């Protein structure tokens, strides 16, 4: 519709046909008008971004480590019961909780119905918004939370877990008691729901998400790529060692693993296992899943990185990622569609380009590489 009212009146029909009670809709939409801060966040294609280095210093702030240790002690009975019942490690659940909402304290400020209506009406990704808005009305209909406290982030990620509405509907859990899957006010529900999703996402209890490794010299950096998986024994068989030299964890010999270089060949290296992929389903950013893994390790005093972070290391803005893709295509190394997104297709082109220069083929775009291309 042209006006918000027109869009709303039209969407009301679709909600009714999909099972929303008329009074659910009207309590949900009472007071609702488009929210320009949500339109701006949706339009923000973050030019200046990361580096993973900075992002990790946020994630792993000792304030958040210690608050996470307090939460583990404060909710230990509940966490024992979740860990036991879902076969998901308490440390991983608490780490996700810290990453997503700082253990309940930064859940976000926006009404989920308003945010998702705004994005359905005038956002870049209206089909997502429509789908999530409908699912969100079902949640209000079932009674998990009153409309007024249905809070979350500008994109509709809700409560303490930052579930989107369709994920809530399929994975949220009522840990007590009371008929409500309340991921907003109930730590029990929230911890149990995160665990449930992690378990559904492949989590194996007691198994490490990954660990830092030492790469031997003149290592083939081509194999650093999450689409490439090899057994731990076979990485040991190309010389990948524990982080202070020596063997890799025994018993894991057959675990599929990938090699992760979040700051290229001069930064630290990690082998990441199945549980890292579980985390990626929760949030499909390798920087996030690494943060999560290290935060969880930090609650027990681990999470320490042996290899230094490159001092140079400056993240490419959205503009210069697009420029890099264009310069790549112009030298015969095709990155695919010029989308400003360094995926597996671009990395493949970065690597062929790095090889042509005699550089290590980590597939990690640097400001220095963008210079050689001019
Ligand atoms: C206090 O530190 C901030 O904590 C925020 C809550 O943990 C976090 O926002 C979360 O980021 C998640 C992944 O990074 C994302 O899935 C959640 O949706 C989001 N939570 C909310 C309510 O939006 C902050 O991280 C973002 C990326 C930021 N503004 O930097 C985090 N901020 C920092 C500097 O660490
Ligand atoms: C915890 C949660 O809801 N994570 C969702 C993930 O399930 C979904 O595949 C993706 C799609 O946008 O967005 C993430 O935030
Ligand atoms: Ca409940």
Coordinates of C-alpha atoms and ligand atoms in Angstrom, one line a residue:
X1 CA 0.0 0.0 0.0
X2 CA 1.0 3.6 -0.5
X3 CA 0.4 5.0 2.9
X4 CA 1.3 3.0 6.0
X5 CA -2.4 2.7 6.8
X6 CA -3.0 1.2 3.3
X7 CA -0.2 -1.3 3.8
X8 CA -1.5 -2.0 7.3
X9 CA -5.1 -2.5 6.2
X10 CA -3.9 -4.9 3.5
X11 CA -1.6 -6.8 5.7
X12 CA -4.5 -7.2 8.2
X13 CA -6.3 -9.3 5.7
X14 CA -3.2 -11.6 5.2
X15 CA -2.8 -12.0 9.0
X16 CA -6.4 -12.9 9.4
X17 CA -6.2 -15.5 6.6
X18 CA -3.1 -16.9 8.3
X19 CA -4.8 -17.4 11.6
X20 CA -4.3 -14.2 13.6
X21 CA -7.4 -13.2 15.7
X22 CA -8.7 -9.7 15.0
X23 CA -8.0 -8.5 18.5
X24 CA -4.5 -9.9 18.5
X25 CA -3.8 -7.8 15.4
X26 CA -5.4 -4.7 16.9
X27 CA -3.6 -4.8 20.3
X28 CA -0.3 -5.5 18.3
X29 CA -0.8 -2.5 16.0
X30 CA -2.3 -0.1 18.5
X31 CA -0.1 3.0 18.3
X32 CA 2.1 1.7 15.5
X33 CA 3.7 4.0 12.9
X34 CA 6.8 3.6 10.8
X35 CA 10.0 3.9 12.6
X36 CA 12.7 5.9 10.7
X37 CA 15.5 4.6 12.9
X38 CA 14.7 1.1 11.7
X39 CA 14.7 2.3 8.0
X40 CA 18.1 3.9 8.6
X41 CA 19.6 0.8 10.2
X42 CA 18.2 -1.3 7.3
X43 CA 19.8 1.1 4.7
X44 CA 23.1 1.2 6.6
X45 CA 25.3 -1.1 4.4
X46 CA 28.2 -0.7 6.9
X47 CA 31.0 1.0 5.0
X48 CA 33.7 1.1 7.7
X49 CA 33.5 -2.2 9.5
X50 CA 35.6 -4.6 11.8
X51 CA 38.7 -5.8 12.0
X52 CA 38.0 -9.0 13.8
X53 CA 40.6 -7.7 16.2
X54 CA 38.4 -4.9 17.4
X55 CA 35.2 -6.9 17.4
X56 CA 36.9 -9.5 19.6
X57 CA 38.0 -6.8 22.1
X58 CA 34.4 -5.9 22.5
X59 CA 33.2 -9.5 22.7
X60 CA 35.9 -10.5 25.2
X61 CA 35.9 -7.5 27.4
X62 CA 36.8 -8.7 30.9
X63 CA 33.7 -7.0 32.1
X64 CA 31.6 -9.4 30.0
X65 CA 33.8 -12.4 30.9
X66 CA 33.3 -11.7 34.6
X67 CA 29.6 -10.9 34.3
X68 CA 29.3 -14.3 32.5
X69 CA 31.1 -16.0 35.3
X70 CA 28.7 -14.4 37.8
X71 CA 25.7 -15.6 35.7
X72 CA 27.1 -19.1 35.7
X73 CA 27.1 -19.2 39.4
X74 CA 23.9 -17.3 39.8
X75 CA 21.9 -19.7 37.5
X76 CA 23.9 -22.9 38.2
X77 CA 20.9 -25.0 39.2
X78 CA 19.1 -24.0 36.0
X79 CA 22.2 -24.4 33.8
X80 CA 22.9 -27.8 35.2
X81 CA 19.4 -28.9 34.3
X82 CA 19.6 -27.4 30.8
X83 CA 23.1 -28.8 30.2
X84 CA 22.0 -32.2 31.3
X85 CA 18.6 -32.3 29.4
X86 CA 19.8 -30.7 26.1
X87 CA 23.4 -32.1 26.1
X88 CA 24.7 -28.6 25.5
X89 CA 27.6 -27.1 27.5
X90 CA 26.6 -24.4 29.9
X91 CA 29.6 -22.3 28.9
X92 CA 28.5 -22.1 25.3
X93 CA 24.9 -21.2 26.2
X94 CA 26.1 -18.4 28.5
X95 CA 28.5 -17.1 26.0
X96 CA 25.8 -16.8 23.3
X97 CA 23.7 -15.1 25.9
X98 CA 26.5 -12.6 26.6
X99 CA 27.1 -12.0 22.9
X100 CA 23.4 -11.6 22.0
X101 CA 22.0 -9.4 24.8
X102 CA 24.9 -9.1 27.4
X103 CA 23.1 -11.7 29.6
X104 CA 19.7 -9.9 29.4
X105 CA 20.8 -6.4 29.9
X106 CA 20.9 -5.0 26.3
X107 CA 18.0 -6.7 24.7
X108 CA 17.3 -3.8 22.5
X109 CA 14.8 -1.0 22.8
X110 CA 12.4 -1.4 19.9
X111 CA 9.0 -2.9 19.6
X112 CA 9.2 -5.9 17.4
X113 CA 5.8 -5.3 15.7
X114 CA 6.7 -1.8 14.8
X115 CA 10.2 -2.7 13.6
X116 CA 9.0 -5.5 11.4
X117 CA 6.0 -3.5 10.1
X118 CA 8.3 -0.7 9.2
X119 CA 10.6 -3.1 7.2
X120 CA 7.6 -4.9 5.5
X121 CA 6.2 -1.6 4.4
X122 CA 9.4 0.1 3.3
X123 CA 12.5 -2.0 3.9
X124 CA 15.0 -3.6 1.6
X125 CA 13.9 -7.1 2.5
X126 CA 10.1 -7.1 2.8
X127 CA 9.5 -10.9 2.3
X128 CA 11.6 -11.6 5.4
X129 CA 9.8 -8.9 7.3
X130 CA 6.4 -10.1 6.3
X131 CA 7.3 -13.7 7.2
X132 CA 8.7 -12.6 10.6
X133 CA 5.8 -10.2 11.3
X134 CA 3.3 -12.9 10.8
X135 CA 5.2 -15.3 13.1
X136 CA 5.5 -12.5 15.7
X137 CA 1.7 -12.1 15.7
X138 CA 1.4 -15.8 16.4
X139 CA 3.6 -15.5 19.4
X140 CA 1.3 -12.7 20.8
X141 CA -1.7 -14.8 20.1
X142 CA -0.3 -17.8 22.0
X143 CA 0.5 -15.5 25.0
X144 CA 4.2 -15.8 25.4
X145 CA 4.6 -12.1 26.1
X146 CA 2.3 -9.0 26.0
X147 CA 2.7 -6.8 23.0
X148 CA 4.1 -3.9 25.1
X149 CA 7.1 -6.0 26.2
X150 CA 7.7 -7.7 22.8
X151 CA 11.1 -5.9 22.5
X152 CA 14.2 -6.6 20.5
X153 CA 16.6 -5.1 18.0
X154 CA 15.8 -3.0 14.8
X155 CA 15.7 -6.1 12.7
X156 CA 13.2 -8.1 14.8
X157 CA 15.7 -10.2 16.8
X158 CA 13.9 -10.7 20.1
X159 CA 14.6 -10.8 23.8
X160 CA 17.5 -12.3 25.7
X161 CA 18.3 -14.7 23.0
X162 CA 17.8 -12.5 19.9
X163 CA 15.7 -15.1 18.2
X164 CA 13.8 -13.9 15.2
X165 CA 10.1 -14.8 15.4
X166 CA 10.2 -17.9 13.2
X167 CA 13.1 -19.3 15.2
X168 CA 11.3 -18.6 18.4
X169 CA 8.2 -20.4 17.2
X170 CA 10.1 -23.5 16.3
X171 CA 12.8 -23.5 19.0
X172 CA 11.8 -21.5 22.1
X173 CA 11.1 -23.5 25.2
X174 CA 9.0 -23.1 28.3
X175 CA 11.5 -24.3 31.0
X176 CA 9.1 -23.7 34.0
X177 CA 6.1 -24.3 34.4
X178 CA 3.8 -21.7 33.2
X179 CA 2.8 -22.2 29.6
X180 CA 4.8 -19.2 28.3
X181 CA 8.0 -19.3 26.2
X182 CA 9.2 -16.1 27.6
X183 CA 12.6 -15.3 26.2
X184 CA 12.2 -11.7 27.4
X185 CA 11.7 -12.0 31.2
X186 CA 12.7 -15.5 32.0
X187 CA 16.3 -16.7 32.1
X188 CA 15.1 -20.3 32.4
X189 CA 13.1 -20.1 29.1
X190 CA 15.9 -18.1 27.5
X191 CA 18.8 -20.5 28.4
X192 CA 16.8 -23.5 27.6
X193 CA 15.7 -22.0 24.2
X194 CA 19.3 -21.2 23.3
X195 CA 20.4 -24.7 24.2
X196 CA 17.5 -26.2 22.2
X197 CA 18.5 -24.4 19.1
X198 CA 22.2 -25.2 19.6
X199 CA 21.3 -28.8 20.0
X200 CA 19.1 -28.7 16.9
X201 CA 22.0 -27.0 15.1
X202 CA 24.4 -30.0 15.6
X203 CA 26.0 -29.4 19.0
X204 CA 28.0 -32.2 20.6
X205 CA 28.5 -31.8 24.3
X206 CA 32.1 -31.8 25.7
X207 CA 33.6 -31.3 22.2
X208 CA 35.6 -28.2 21.5
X209 CA 34.4 -25.6 19.0
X210 CA 38.0 -25.3 17.8
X211 CA 41.4 -24.3 19.0
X212 CA 44.4 -22.3 17.9
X213 CA 47.1 -24.1 15.9
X214 CA 50.6 -23.4 14.6
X215 CA 50.9 -23.6 10.8
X216 CA 54.2 -24.9 9.4
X217 CA 56.2 -22.7 7.0
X218 CA 55.3 -22.5 3.3
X219 CA 51.9 -23.8 4.3
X220 CA 49.4 -24.0 1.5
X221 CA 47.0 -21.2 2.6
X222 CA 44.5 -22.3 -0.1
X223 CA 43.1 -24.8 2.4
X224 CA 42.0 -22.1 4.8
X225 CA 38.4 -22.0 3.9
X226 CA 35.2 -23.2 5.8
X227 CA 34.0 -25.1 2.7
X228 CA 37.1 -27.2 3.0
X229 CA 36.9 -29.9 5.7
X230 CA 39.5 -32.5 6.6
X231 CA 40.0 -34.8 9.5
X232 CA 42.1 -33.6 12.5
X233 CA 44.6 -36.5 11.8
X234 CA 45.0 -35.3 8.2
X235 CA 45.7 -31.7 9.2
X236 CA 48.3 -33.1 11.6
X237 CA 49.6 -34.9 8.5
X238 CA 50.4 -31.7 6.7
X239 CA 52.3 -30.4 9.7
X240 CA 49.5 -28.5 11.6
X241 CA 50.6 -28.6 15.2
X242 CA 49.3 -27.6 18.7
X243 CA 49.8 -24.0 19.3
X244 CA 53.1 -24.5 21.2
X245 CA 54.3 -27.2 18.8
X246 CA 53.5 -30.9 19.1
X247 CA 50.5 -33.1 18.6
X248 CA 46.8 -32.2 18.3
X249 CA 44.3 -33.4 20.9
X250 CA 44.1 -37.2 21.0
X251 CA 40.7 -38.9 20.4
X252 CA 39.7 -36.3 17.9
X253 CA 41.7 -37.8 15.0
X254 CA 38.6 -38.3 12.9
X255 CA 36.7 -35.1 13.5
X256 CA 36.1 -33.0 10.4
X257 CA 37.8 -29.6 10.7
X258 CA 38.5 -26.4 8.8
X259 CA 41.2 -23.9 9.0
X260 CA 40.4 -20.3 9.9
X261 CA 42.6 -17.3 9.4
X262 CA 40.6 -14.3 10.5
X263 CA 43.4 -11.9 9.9
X264 CA 45.3 -13.8 7.2
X265 CA 48.6 -15.7 7.3
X266 CA 50.3 -13.2 9.7
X267 CA 47.5 -13.5 12.3
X268 CA 46.5 -16.5 14.4
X269 CA 45.2 -19.8 13.0
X270 CA 42.4 -21.9 14.3
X271 CA 41.1 -25.3 13.4
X272 CA 37.4 -25.2 13.9
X273 CA 35.2 -28.2 14.4
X274 CA 31.7 -29.2 14.1
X275 CA 30.4 -27.2 17.1
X276 CA 31.8 -24.0 15.4
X277 CA 29.4 -24.7 12.5
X278 CA 26.6 -25.2 15.1
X279 CA 27.3 -21.6 16.2
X280 CA 27.3 -20.3 12.7
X281 CA 23.7 -21.4 12.4
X282 CA 22.9 -19.3 15.4
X283 CA 24.6 -16.3 13.7
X284 CA 26.3 -16.8 10.3
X285 CA 29.4 -14.8 10.9
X286 CA 32.7 -16.5 11.5
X287 CA 33.9 -13.5 13.6
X288 CA 30.9 -14.0 15.9
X289 CA 31.3 -17.8 16.2
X290 CA 35.0 -17.3 17.1
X291 CA 34.0 -14.6 19.7
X292 CA 31.5 -17.1 21.1
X293 CA 34.0 -19.9 21.3
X294 CA 36.7 -17.8 23.0
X295 CA 34.2 -16.2 25.4
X296 CA 33.1 -19.6 26.5
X297 CA 36.7 -20.7 26.9
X298 CA 37.4 -17.5 28.9
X299 CA 34.9 -18.4 31.6
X300 CA 37.2 -21.3 32.6
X301 CA 40.4 -19.2 32.1
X302 CA 41.1 -20.1 28.6
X303 CA 40.5 -18.0 25.5
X304 CA 44.0 -16.8 25.3
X305 CA 45.5 -16.2 21.8
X306 CA 49.2 -17.1 21.3
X307 CA 49.8 -15.6 17.9
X308 CA 49.8 -11.8 17.7
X309 CA 47.2 -9.8 15.8
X310 CA 48.7 -8.0 12.8
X311 CA 49.2 -4.4 13.6
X312 CA 48.7 -3.2 10.0
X313 CA 45.3 -4.9 9.4
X314 CA 42.7 -2.4 8.4
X315 CA 39.2 -3.7 7.4
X316 CA 38.0 -2.8 3.9
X317 CA 35.0 -0.5 3.8
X318 CA 31.9 -1.5 1.6
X319 CA 33.1 0.9 -1.1
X320 CA 36.6 -0.6 -1.4
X321 CA 35.3 -4.2 -1.2
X322 CA 33.3 -3.4 -4.3
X323 CA 36.3 -1.7 -5.8
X324 CA 38.5 -4.8 -5.0
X325 CA 36.0 -7.0 -6.7
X326 CA 36.0 -4.8 -9.8
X327 CA 39.8 -4.7 -9.9
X328 CA 39.9 -8.5 -9.5
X329 CA 37.5 -9.1 -12.4
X330 CA 39.6 -6.7 -14.5
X331 CA 42.8 -8.8 -14.1
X332 CA 41.0 -12.0 -15.1
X333 CA 40.4 -13.3 -11.6
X334 CA 36.7 -13.5 -11.4
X335 CA 35.1 -12.9 -7.9
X336 CA 31.6 -13.6 -9.2
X337 CA 28.9 -10.9 -8.9
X338 CA 30.2 -7.6 -7.6
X339 CA 28.2 -7.5 -4.4
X340 CA 30.6 -5.9 -1.9
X341 CA 30.6 -9.3 0.0
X342 CA 33.8 -11.3 0.4
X343 CA 32.3 -14.8 0.0
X344 CA 33.9 -18.0 -1.1
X345 CA 33.8 -16.8 -4.7
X346 CA 35.7 -13.6 -4.1
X347 CA 38.2 -15.3 -1.8
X348 CA 38.9 -17.8 -4.6
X349 CA 39.8 -14.7 -6.8
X350 CA 41.8 -13.0 -4.1
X351 CA 43.9 -16.2 -3.8
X352 CA 44.6 -16.5 -7.5
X353 CA 45.4 -12.9 -7.5
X354 CA 47.8 -13.3 -4.4
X355 CA 49.5 -16.2 -6.1
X356 CA 50.1 -14.1 -9.3
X357 CA 51.9 -11.7 -7.0
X358 CA 53.9 -14.3 -5.2
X359 CA 52.0 -13.6 -2.0
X360 CA 50.6 -16.2 0.5
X361 CA 47.2 -17.2 -0.8
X362 CA 45.2 -16.7 2.4
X363 CA 42.4 -15.1 0.5
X364 CA 42.3 -12.3 3.0
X365 CA 41.8 -8.9 1.3
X366 CA 44.2 -6.3 2.6
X367 CA 44.5 -2.5 2.0
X368 CA 48.0 -3.4 0.5
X369 CA 46.5 -5.8 -2.1
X370 CA 44.1 -3.0 -3.2
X371 CA 47.2 -0.9 -3.7
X372 CA 49.0 -3.5 -5.9
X373 CA 45.8 -3.4 -8.1
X374 CA 46.6 0.2 -9.0
Ligands
LIG1 C1 27.7 -4.1 25.3 O1 28.3 -4.7 24.1 C2 27.3 -4.8 23.0 O2 26.5 -5.9 23.3 C3 25.4 -5.9 22.5 C4 24.5 -7.0 23.1 O3 25.4 -8.1 23.2 C5 25.8 -6.4 21.1 O4 24.7 -6.4 20.2 C6 24.4 -7.8 19.7 O5 25.2 -8.2 18.7 C7 25.0 -9.5 18.3 C8 26.2 -10.1 17.6 O6 27.2 -9.1 17.6 C9 23.6 -9.5 17.6 O7 23.2 -10.9 17.2 C10 22.5 -9.0 18.5 O8 21.3 -8.8 17.7 C11 22.9 -7.7 19.2 N1 22.1 -7.4 20.3 C12 21.1 -6.3 20.2 C13 20.2 -6.0 21.3 O9 21.1 -5.7 19.2 C14 26.8 -5.4 20.6 O10 27.3 -5.7 19.3 C15 27.0 -4.9 18.1 C16 27.5 -5.6 16.9 C17 27.6 -3.4 18.2 N2 26.7 -2.3 18.3 O11 28.8 -3.3 18.3 C18 27.9 -5.2 21.6 N3 28.7 -4.0 21.2 C19 30.2 -4.0 21.4 C20 30.9 -2.7 21.0 O12 30.7 -5.0 21.9
LIG2 C1 19.0 -17.0 16.9 C2 18.4 -16.6 15.5 O1 17.2 -16.4 15.4 N1 19.3 -16.6 14.5 C3 18.9 -16.3 13.2 C4 19.0 -17.6 12.3 O2 18.2 -18.6 12.8 C5 18.5 -17.2 10.9 O3 18.8 -18.3 10.0 C6 19.1 -15.9 10.3 C7 18.3 -15.4 9.1 O4 18.3 -14.0 9.1 O5 19.1 -14.9 11.3 C8 19.7 -15.2 12.6 O6 19.7 -14.2 13.5
LIG3 CA1 8.0 -20.0 31.0

